[PDB]
Ligand binder design. Sequence first.
Ligand code: ZN
Lengths: 566, 242, 104, 187, 189
Amino acid sequence: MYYGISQFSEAYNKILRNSSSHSSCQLVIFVSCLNIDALCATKMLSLLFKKQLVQSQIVPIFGYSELRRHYSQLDDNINSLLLVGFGGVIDLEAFLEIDPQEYVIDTDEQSFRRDIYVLDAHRPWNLDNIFGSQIIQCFDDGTVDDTLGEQKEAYYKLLELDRKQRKKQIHEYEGVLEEYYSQGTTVVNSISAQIYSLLSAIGETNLSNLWLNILGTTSLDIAYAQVYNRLYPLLQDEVKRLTPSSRNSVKTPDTLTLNIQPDYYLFLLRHSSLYDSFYYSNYVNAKLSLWNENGKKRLHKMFARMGIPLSTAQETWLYMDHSIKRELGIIFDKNLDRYGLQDIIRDGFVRTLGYRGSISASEFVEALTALLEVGNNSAQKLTNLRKRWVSNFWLSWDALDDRKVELLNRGIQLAQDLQRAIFNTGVAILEKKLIKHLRIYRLCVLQDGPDLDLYRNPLTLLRLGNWLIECCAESEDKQLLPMVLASIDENTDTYLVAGLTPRYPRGLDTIHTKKPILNNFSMAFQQITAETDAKVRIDNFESSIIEIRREDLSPFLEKLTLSGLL
Amino acid sequence: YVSPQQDFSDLMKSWKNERCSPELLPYPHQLMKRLLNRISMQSQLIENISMGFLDMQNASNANPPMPNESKLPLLCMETELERLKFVIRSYIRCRLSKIDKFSLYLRQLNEDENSLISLTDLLSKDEIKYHDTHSLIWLKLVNDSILKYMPEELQAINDTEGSVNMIDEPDWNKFVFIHVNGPPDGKWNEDPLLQENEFGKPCYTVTIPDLKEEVELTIGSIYVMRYEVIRDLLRDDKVALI
Amino acid sequence: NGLDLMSSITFSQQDTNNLSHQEQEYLKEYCDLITDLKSGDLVDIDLSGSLVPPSDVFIDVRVLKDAGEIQTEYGVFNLIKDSQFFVRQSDVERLIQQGYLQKI
Amino acid sequence: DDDNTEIIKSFKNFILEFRLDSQFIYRDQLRNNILVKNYSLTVNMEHLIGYNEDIYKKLSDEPSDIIPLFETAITQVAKRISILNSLPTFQLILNSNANQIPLRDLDSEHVSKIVRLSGIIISTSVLSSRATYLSIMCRNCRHTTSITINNFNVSLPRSCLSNCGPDPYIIIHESSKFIDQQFLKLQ
Amino acid sequence: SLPAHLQQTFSPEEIQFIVENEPIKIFPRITTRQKITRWQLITTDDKALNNMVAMRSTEVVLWIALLLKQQSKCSIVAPQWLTTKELDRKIQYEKTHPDRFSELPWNWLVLARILFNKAKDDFHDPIHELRGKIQDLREIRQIKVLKGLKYLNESHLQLDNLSLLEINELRPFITEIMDKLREIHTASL
Ligand SMILES: [Zn+2]
């Protein structure tokens, strides 16, 4: 309960008191790269600090080792540190070798020399950071006040409690303490929503902040639908609150329009054809099996029934027939039910600026992700790759400014190419039966084939994994086994291995709805790594992604088979 | 005088006249001294407040300078000093380039006995050192490179009797844009040069002898004119180069 | 910005062997002349400073080349590569001129 | 005529009020073209769709009839932004990003519709003359007359205006204006 | 000075500097009246800045106004000529007299661009209409300049009310053409 939802304001005031100055820079923000929510939140914070004239620095880091190396070089003149996208799960004081008594410069409690704020959404929390540390402070959103009721008592009372009742109680409370741990990890909220709450508390909300909040929230749709369904009504309310007025007389080159219009679960509808949108969709592919000939024939039959000529459905959206575009909603409503695709109809947010063209939030986040993925003796080889991944962050950052639209178009083209490549690899995976069904998990190792140099980036492998999980969720086979995806890099001679959680069908009822399936690959990987001298690298922010040498892959996986917890 | 605003106005008008003029204008000795003294005192002043604010902060973990009525004044001091320094820097470098262009002409002016123009008035002391050093360095370069292999008849870098004159002089008939301010301060009746015209404000008169014509310049109008016929008016602040 | 040009660190604009020996000598004395100009009566004004007027108090800059911590008047800048700064223009004019920073 | 005037007005407002960021691109292009004696204008269809979809829909279904109205709107705007008049009727050149249709897929379904296609030039003919302003006189009453023609597919009147014959009219070739026509072959 | 031309012509940024060295009117949102740290400026009179009261009209130099509006402590009032009515009057005056330039301030283009960029909220009229009117005026002024360029000679020219930016963008052509004509005439004497 360090900083509650209501308390978010006062912490800001502290940053205004210690850091703001016209002759020195004393605020540093460490933001997790390869993440869209963190990027949007950092953009909002940067604009806020720019308005109040507070000097700042933004440093994109990739892993925990980078953070540890950068913390030492950081001076004592920097009074404020902001860790965005990470830091909640691990013990920060032990990791950074922070001595509480060393940081007291304002003797009295202790005001302390430096303040570190943690803005993260990866549960479970670390009990040490929440309940036992004073230098480390976190922006909580209501997990502790409700979920961690007995944990606080156990922690504090075990700290203070340190003749047979003593032995009994200490054991049956360390049992509860270990019960809190040994649990998988999920995401339950979004950073951009919390920053928008801070904005509303201070009172600096506008259309740009709302657009950034929508962009941050939308990115969670593919992996965590429950959070999106929870946060959507508040976004709808805030959109209606900030509408300029009624009866807009004329469209002028300076109008901005944020509208709630009906959209569809289709891949880049307004920047490609209709046939392409239906072809390269995860949901349509899962529901119709387009990778073989039968799915393509079924799609052709559907398009024939709907009344759209096959020649017209392959034209660009701008140059598509006006009459067909006008009546698309009725045609969808009356025909989509026969083929099980009635779930593709939804409502979203569309933004328009003058005589330019309309863009939806989903297309924007796909363009940003595409810009993240592609843009612009083995240790150096990995270092160069990580440096390029850091470099792509500024390319994605620039695309959020209204002046740079050519970069957004480039991102759209890159997204189209990337999705085509993912589809091409997925059909090969599915046709040759490369997926092996073990008792505990399902294995997929890509050793040979073209364009394996695209899967050295975690985001592309997550794309392919999301394709495969979506394909498996709608399969009639009923199972919830986690999946393992491994990809080789010849230059480094290392496999990059990722563990992926199962997902329920998109349209399934809410009776099973709960806190989603927990990811248990981090604990298993740590358990196997500790016991054996395997040449593995666990250094990414996502604990479910590791880099294992080629020789160790086949034995390590065997150990995983007996590890359990999967 | 005794007005800090008029010093900045005079510096700006001198810079504007300097950039657009062909010749090497006289140096405003007093104005530069006053401005340099003012800058020297002002920098010490901002340094003093900065030190005073810093020292008290570390003593007893006191609060920083309270934000209201604090930051904006000092920020304005800094930016104002920055702008003034830029203006003076541009003025000095432009006149140094013009000095570079006319080294031999200035030397010939200084060497002439019956010349009212003297380098002690037209050139600053640092500019005198610059001129002397640059002339010697350039002479050494040309003597070592080319002029050593030449007959004694023609070994002079300044030859006014050769086929082509080797000493370049300022263009006295360059065309410039001018604005007619009128009297520098006022008292339109006091100025003898002012003469009224039909249904109009008083206008200056000038003569072009090569064309042999009389040109009238009305107050408040912008003209494109020869530089020689307007030298006296510019020297007396009646006209301003735009 | 004055300096001794080829003897000290140069901006790599010119190769040593293009210039003649007499030109190399001439450049040296010209640089010395610039140097003892800059220490004249105009100490406060930087005669080798920027020649574009100042019109933006606060600017965004990006680091081009990696470096260590550099002290500035009343503070410190940490030059981690691929990081962005929001700071006053006067502090970073020197670093932009020498190629360690981008943008304005 | 009560619809053509509004169409011309809509086109002139498109030319004069389109802006992206801080520059009227189509207003500046006209002035730059007039200076180097280029009497033409190039318009991108995406901008026209963005400005107003009704205007694009009007053009997309009746090209031969609508295009001359845009032609005269351009030269009305030019005489306003150039003159406070030897300016001929301007030319409109269009750019499109729609799907390309093969030559062998062109049939009776595509008549009177704007299409985009690619091929290979195999032959180019010689330049020929087409009349735009015709000066006309009658064989008997002998009075002056004029005719204006646009090349978007006319004949001399089959009557007399003020007995004269059936269709008595001859062309006064001097004081008549002509343009350049060329024929090309594709594959 | 020497590099990038700059020998005998001003850059647009220096023209902007000269424009921002001119006064403007504001409505302060703060009160800095002395009680019953101070500005102490060296190039501009600080009497108004020291004695400030909220919701009252004062005038300062332009760049201080921009610096204040960077924060939330100012609101600049646009000059009276930046109105649709006063612009339409000048357009009509421009149309009726085809041999003289209308009387606009010598910084109208630079001031208009700066105010549109910085103080967009302060205008009362819609900004797109004013932006169109500015272009309408500029085109006609360009037509008149093009017609007047035909009367070039060796003696002198008069451009009574031409703006600063218009003079700057035309100086190198005009000066050099008349200089060459003057040399040709002088040679024949
Ligand atoms: Zn007849």
